[PDB]
Design a protein around this ligand. Structure first.
Ligand SMILES: Nc1ncnc2c1ncn2[C@@H]1O[C@H](COP(=O)(O)OP(=O)(O)NP(=O)(O)O)[C@@H](O)[C@H]1O
Ligand SMILES: [Mg+2]
Lengths: 352, 138, 49, 33, 50, 49
């Protein structure tokens, strides 16, 4: 069965999940497996948080997994982990090799086949194909369109390289983006999944390759909860282009329609009130009135929200440094309480 | 072993590097027999344990976050006497007081993990060495 | 869309053209624009050669 | 005498209460301990 | 004339090796991309141009 | 300050490491190429341009 846990940012979805897993750990320390599925950047975080119970101070029944980790586990029990692993660079190397003997068959990328940047581009493309479940046959298969001629030339060349790669790797090697597909086809045969409870949270969207795994878990696991950051999403239709929760909305729509497609018992939980910004009016106002047009102005006092203008990135970082000092020296915070985010970290990394 | 070779759970070179006698001998042992005859059994047990930083480091603080210690327990089985822990080692032997201290803190970590998280006591620990089929208890 | 708009120098547009259609000429997709001195230094080397 | 003598003095003598654990790796291995 | 022409050819080769281009190469390579056939000034638009 | 930042840009481009960087700067000056003095007030600010 499935449970769709949905709410806006600050609703309490994550904490709710943590508390559920913790209670479940208290009730049956050696019960059926508990799988916490999160993005890689979130794994350690959740491990820590689950380990912070005065009650227990750790876990055994419950484990935290990324798609990659999950694949590694299930494959280490069901098989398929034995065959060699290829890095992205290794694949690039193979691709270059294939280019050197298939360049004369190309229709468009013959001249470009000379350059080392081209092999990287092809690597990126083929990886994307595998992530969106498109075997070389489907590439070969591929509303009148102006660029159709060139596109078909490209796809033609790509199909040559792709099929040649799959041929060279067959019965010998494992592409980097094959773990998830191999995982999808060993989940039915895996005993640990069969009684397991699964929570998935942190994801905004899924690659088709990841969806395959998700629906397999929908089938062979006991229950699975999908935690999405959105506001009352529709199963009836995908979100509008300009909608705030476009991505997570679409994720909800697809996940739900596949839960329905497999006749699962579904449970809806909607988190309404804020928990994060309970004590901070400005941040709750910002969180709620973000999308709103026209936006209602905040009428109260300024304290917890500051827009800052720096003379340059050097000034920006030093200013923030001073502020952080103030926060840990006067306002009683600790360094771990602070977060610094940049859309383009490369602009700040060294200077930071 | 062969099934593990056809499931690709074990490579060909991995398959051929097996001393079948050495592993079969384990099931002729006392701890092995007690393993076969247990209320409940489990293998490859993953665990995370939260130890307050002061225990590993002097000068830590009660406020300061615990450190997270992580590992995998080889085997755990339960009889009418209690819960026992089992681990396998391919350590070179053919030595007991040395191996005892070599893995002592590790075993203590495992036991403390089971005791704290499972809220259950652990009576007796066992380490089986493939070389000569030795078994030492802690 | 004003971010993705084609409103710039003609040289900037040229950069866009090269980036898309590198494969039509003898150009690496990951090419970089040299700065004045490094370009001219390379020119000095080839001229000496 | 200056209006910011005491605060300047106190801030230049300040140290972070939890300085000792800022470099301590959170995650530890059984081998590591 | 033949000296200057050689320099240019050798120069372009050097930059291609290090995968770099002039400001000049911007305009000229762009023009090269945009043309398919070039009969003494009469330039026919290539696919990119279209 | 801009000595630092210019080091940052040239490192990232073709002159990573002290020896290569210095060689670039030296060859730059040796053929009469220069760089501008740094700026304090930005163009946006209240200044006679
Ligand atoms: N029951 C609760 N009461 C009060 N505060 C809470 C509660 N649960 C969580 N919080 C606080 O809420 C904040 C974030 O909660 P969280 O569980 O991450 O919500 P969320 O739905 O995951 N937000 P997001 O991941 O951005 O969509 C944290 O700072 C928690 O301390
Ligand atoms: Mg969350």
């Amino acid at each position: 069965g499935a449970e769709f846990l949905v709410g806006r940012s600050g609703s309490g979805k994550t904490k709710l999940i943590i508390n559920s897993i913790q209670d479940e750990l208290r009730r049956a320390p050696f019960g059926k497996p508990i799988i916490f599925l999160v993005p890689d950047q979130m794994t350690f975080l959740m491990e820590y948080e689950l380990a912070k119970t005065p009650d227990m101070g750790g876990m055994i029944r419950a484990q935290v997994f990324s798609f990659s980790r999950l694949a590694w586990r299930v494959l280490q029990h069901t098989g398929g982990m034995s065959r060699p692993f290829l890095t992205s660079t290794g694949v690039q190397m193979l691709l270059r090799k294939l280019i050197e003997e298939h360049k004369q068959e190309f229709k468009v990328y013959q001249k470009a086949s000379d350059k080392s940047g081209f092999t990287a581009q092809v690597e990126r493309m083929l990886t994307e194909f595998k992530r969106y479940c498109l075997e070389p046959e489907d590439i070969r298969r591929m509303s009148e369109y102006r660029g159709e001629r060139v596109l078909s030339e490209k796809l033609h060349d790509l199909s040559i390289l792709y099929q040649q790669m799959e041929k060279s790797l067959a019965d010998q090697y494992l592409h980097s983006e094959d773990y998830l597909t191999l995982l999808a086809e060993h989940i039915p045969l895996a005993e640990d999944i069969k009684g397991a409870h699964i929570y998935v949270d942190g994801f905004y969207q899924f690659t088709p390759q990841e969806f395959r795994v998700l629906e397999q878990l929908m089938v062979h696991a006991e229950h699975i909860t999908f935690s999405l950051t959105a506001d009352k999403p529709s199963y009836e239709r995908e979100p509008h282009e300009l909608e705030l929760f476009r991505m997570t909305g679409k994720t909800y729509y697809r996940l739900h329609q596949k839960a329905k497609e497999l006749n699962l018992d579904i449970t809806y939980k909607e988190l309404s009130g804020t928990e994060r910004h309970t004590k901070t009016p400005e941040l709750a106002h910002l969180e709620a009135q973000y999308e709103a047009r026209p936006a209602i102005p905040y009428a109260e006092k300024q304290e917890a929200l500051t827009v800052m203008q720096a003379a340059n990135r050097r000034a920006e970082l030093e200013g923030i440094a001073r502020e952080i000092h103030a926060l840990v020296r006067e306002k009683g915070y600790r360094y771990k309480d602070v977060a610094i985010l940049a859309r383009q970290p490369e602009d700040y990394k060294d200077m930071v | 072993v062969h099934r593990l070779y056809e499931k690709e759970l074990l490579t060909e070179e991995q398959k051929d590097a097996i001393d079948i006698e050495e592993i079969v001998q384990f099931f002729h042992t006392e701890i092995g027999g007690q393993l076969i005859g247990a209320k409940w059994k489990d293998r490859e047990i993953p665990f995370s344990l939260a130890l307050p930083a002061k225990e590993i480091y002097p000068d830590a603080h009660e406020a300061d976050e615990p450190l997270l210690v992580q590992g995998i327990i080889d085997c755990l089985y339960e009889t009418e006497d209690g819960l026992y822990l089992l681990a396998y080692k391919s350590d070179r032997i053919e030595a007991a007081p040395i191996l005892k201290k070599r893995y002592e803190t590790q075993i203590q970590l495992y036991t403390k993990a089971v005791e704290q998280i499972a809220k259950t006591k652990v009576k007796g620990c066992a380490l089986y060495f493939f070389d000569g089929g030795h078994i030492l208890t802690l | 869309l004003l971010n993705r708009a084609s409103i710039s120098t003609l040289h900037s547009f040229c950069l866009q053209v090269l980036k898309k259609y590198y494969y039509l000429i003898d150009l690496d997709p990951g090419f970089r624009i040299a700065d004045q001195t490094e370009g001219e230094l390379i020119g000095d080397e080839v001229l000496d050669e | 005498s200056f209006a910011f003598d005491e605060k300047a003095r106190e801030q230049l003598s300040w140290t972070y209460p939890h300085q000792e654990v800022t470099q301590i790796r959170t995650k530890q291995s059984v081998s590591e301990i | 004339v033949q000296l200057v022409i050689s320099y240019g050819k050798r120069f372009e080769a050097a930059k291609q090796e290090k995968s770099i281009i002039d400001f000049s190469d911007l305009e000229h390579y762009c023009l090269a991309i945009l043309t398919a056939e070039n009969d003494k000034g009469e330039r026919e638009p290539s696919e990119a141009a279209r | 300050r801009v000595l630092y930042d210019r080091a940052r840009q040239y490192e990232s481009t073709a002159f990573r490491g002290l020896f290569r960087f210095l060689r670039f700067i030296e060859r730059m000056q040796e053929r009469g190429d220069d760089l501008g003095t740094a700026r304090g007030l930005s163009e946006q600010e209240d200044v006679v341009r």
